[PDB]
Design a protein around this ligand. Structure first.
Ligand SMILES: Cn1cnc2c(O)nc(N)nc21
Ligand SMILES: [Ca+2]
Length: 581
DNA sequence: ACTGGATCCA
DNA sequence: CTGGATCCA
């Protein structure tokens, strides 16, 4: 179509080093760790400039400019640029605006993943989607210099022009401090985390993988004996044919293409045939083997024996982070065979230890705070076992009349309450009927009328405003809250109930990370953040710092915000992640 | 099936 | 160009 004017520079000049600029330090590899910087673009009051990285990054004044906190840069996905630079021994500072995080706050549902998607939100279309320039995947190539250079300049141009309107809307939404004081500082901390990585004991993992391949070989053969034939145990067609046609097992549930084989269903079928328990066992081992063992071993960098996740800070609808390549927010814990995987996550230096602090029932505590339910707030003020308390109220029994099955039902009710309670959902979860679920629910609201009030109020608020909000003013638009379709409307209503809870808990732990990173430097500790797992933080530190951390970390996490109820943090440390329990 | 995720599989 | 199964908070 048209061409944007810019200087294709081949040396750094002084006018490129103004104290405010849009900056693009482009990394095209999806995974940016130790990845190439393919080009650089600067747009400031003086003009528009493209620089080849091998020039710019070898230039002393440019590098000094990058690291000077007083020279302000506007960017998109500054964490990607900061991390690729960290791997090159270069420090990036003074990022005062990140367009990706600004777009995220304004509307998490837009799924902005390039400068073009963010630009579209304010009707600016003078820039191409990255996919148009680079291609899909495995055809994805860096193009030739004139194509590349104009593209980076156009993105930088967009960033320069869109700061004002993004900030104005953030300000109108009261989300400007959310971006400036929370999401942007947190982005620097995440960059440090990702870069630091987590040391992995690959021999431990290789040996677990060996035992797994052993057991898996045994179970697989047994399965073939019992089926009287070989088949692909991971094929849905083939396993369905064996269970339900050759062995004539009852069909308790269908998927929309065939028979359900979820573990749920399989447990009911166990009484009928010895094959079932074995398939369950195979699925358990096979998940461990192919996802955790083989998966982790594939992404460990052999140069450092570390894994360097990426924490996606602009993806979830609620404001949580997610983690990819590897996902280190889903390492097994609940069953012991899987938990053993955590034995392979080790401190990065000798005589250091892993330290883990987790919030105790933050969501339920946030809910008490938001709903101001007198009885919920008393329960946490009396630091009660919340599930046992809910069993007492719903079943009207005394503490020592609470049976294990009673506590289990009340636990499930507590989960449903935070998720957005559903008589069907609870009934499915508990394997009971909707009418019996409805009465648990009804008993819950009699015991906790402030919470019922909150669930009613928040749905009406979502309806009238068009969105819900968290404690630190994160927003989520719920246009389906008025659908005439029952399923669709009900789902929005759950999102209305859950999002201030889940999202406020995200707000809190994010603030806690920022506060903690400041306190650790103030305290001159060598301890640092490795991971966040929604309501927990994992650090590593010299053994000599364990005692100060036992007091410091819970204190900081507990005081991140002050609610109508206290927050409670437990901590553990040990020589592996497995032992910090 | 009552929230939010990621990855392996076919 | 996915949707089922299963691991996490
Ligand atoms: C075998 N195989 C590879 N990719 C696939 C996909 O997307 N769907 C299905 N059904 N099979 C696939
Ligand atoms: Ca497909």
């Amino acid at each position: 179509g048209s061409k944007m004017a810019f200087t294709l520079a081949d040396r750094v000049t002084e006018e490129m080093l103004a104290d405010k600029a849009a900056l693009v330090v482009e990394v095209v590899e999806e995974n940016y760790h130790d990845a190439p910087i393919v080009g650089i673009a600067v747009v400031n009051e003086h003009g528009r400039f493209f620089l080849r990285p091998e020039t710019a990054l070898a230039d002393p004044q440019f590098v000094a400019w990058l690291g000077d906190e007083t020279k302000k840069k506007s960017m998109f996905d500054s964490k990607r640029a900061a991390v690729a630079l960290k791997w090159k021994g270069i420090e990036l500072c003074g990022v005062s605006f990140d367009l990706l995080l600004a777009a995220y706050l304004l509307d998490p549902a837009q799924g902005v993943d390039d400068v073009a998607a963010a630009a579209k939100m304010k009707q600016y279309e003078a820039v191409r989607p990255d996919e148009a320039v680079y291609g899909k995947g495995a055809k994805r190539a860096v193009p030739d210099e004139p194509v590349l250079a104009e593209h980076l300049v156009r993105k930088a141009a967009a960033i320069w022009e869109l700061e004002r309107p993004f900030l104005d809307e953030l300000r109108r939404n009261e989300q400007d401090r959310l971006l400036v004081e929370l999401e942007q500082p947190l982005s620097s901390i995440l960059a440090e985390m990702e870069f630091a990585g987590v040391k992995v004991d690959t021999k431990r993992l290789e040996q677990m993988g060996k035992e797994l391949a052993e057991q898996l070989g045994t179970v697989e053969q047994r399965i073939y004996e019992l089926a009287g034939q070989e088949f692909n145990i991971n094929s849905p067609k083939q396993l369905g044919v064996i269970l339900f046609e050759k062995l004539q097992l009852p069909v308790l549930k269908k998927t929309k293409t065939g028979y359900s084989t979820s573990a749920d269903v399989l447990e009911k079928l166990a009484p009928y045939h010895e094959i079932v328990e074995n398939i369950l066992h195979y699925r358990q081992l096979g998940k461990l083997q192919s996802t955790y063992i083989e998966g982790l071993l594939k992404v460990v960098r052999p140069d450092t024996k570390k894994v360097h996740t990426i924490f996606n800070q602009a993806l979830t609808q609620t404001g949580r982070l997610s983690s990819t390549e590897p996902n280190l927010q889903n390492i097994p814990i609940r069953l012991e065979e899987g938990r053993k995987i955590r034995q392979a996550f080790v401190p990065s230096e000798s005589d250091w230890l892993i330290f883990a602090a987790d919030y105790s029932q933050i969501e339920l505590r946030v809910l008490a705070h938001i709903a101001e339910d007198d009885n919920l707030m008393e329960a946490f003020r009396r630091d009660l076992d919340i599930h046992t308390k809910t069993a007492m109220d719903i079943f009207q029994v005394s503490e020592d009349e609470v049976t294990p099955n009673m506590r289990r039902q009340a636990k499930a009710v507590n989960f449903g309450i935070v998720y957005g309670i559903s008589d069907y959902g609870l009934a499915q979860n508990l394997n009971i009927s909707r009418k019996e679920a409805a009465e648990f629910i009804e008993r819950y609201f009699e015991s906790f009328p402030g919470v019922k009030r909150y669930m009613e109020n928040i749905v009406q608020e979502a309806k009238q405003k068009g969105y819900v909000t968290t404690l630190l003013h994160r927003r989520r638009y719920l246009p389906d809250i008025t659908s005439r379709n029952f399923n669709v409307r009900s789902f929005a209503e759950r999102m209305a109930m859950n999002t201030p809870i889940q999202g406020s808990a995200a707000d809190i732990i994010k603030k806690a990370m920022i506060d903690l990173n400041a306190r650790l430097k103030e305290e001159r500790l060598q301890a640092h953040l490795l991971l966040q797992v929604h309501d927990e933080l994992i650090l590593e530190a010299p053994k000599e710092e364990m005692e100060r951390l036992c007091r410091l970390v819970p204190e900081v996490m507990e005081q991140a915000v002050t609610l109508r109820v206290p927050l409670k943090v437990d901590y553990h440390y040990g020589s592996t992640w497995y032992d910090a329990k």
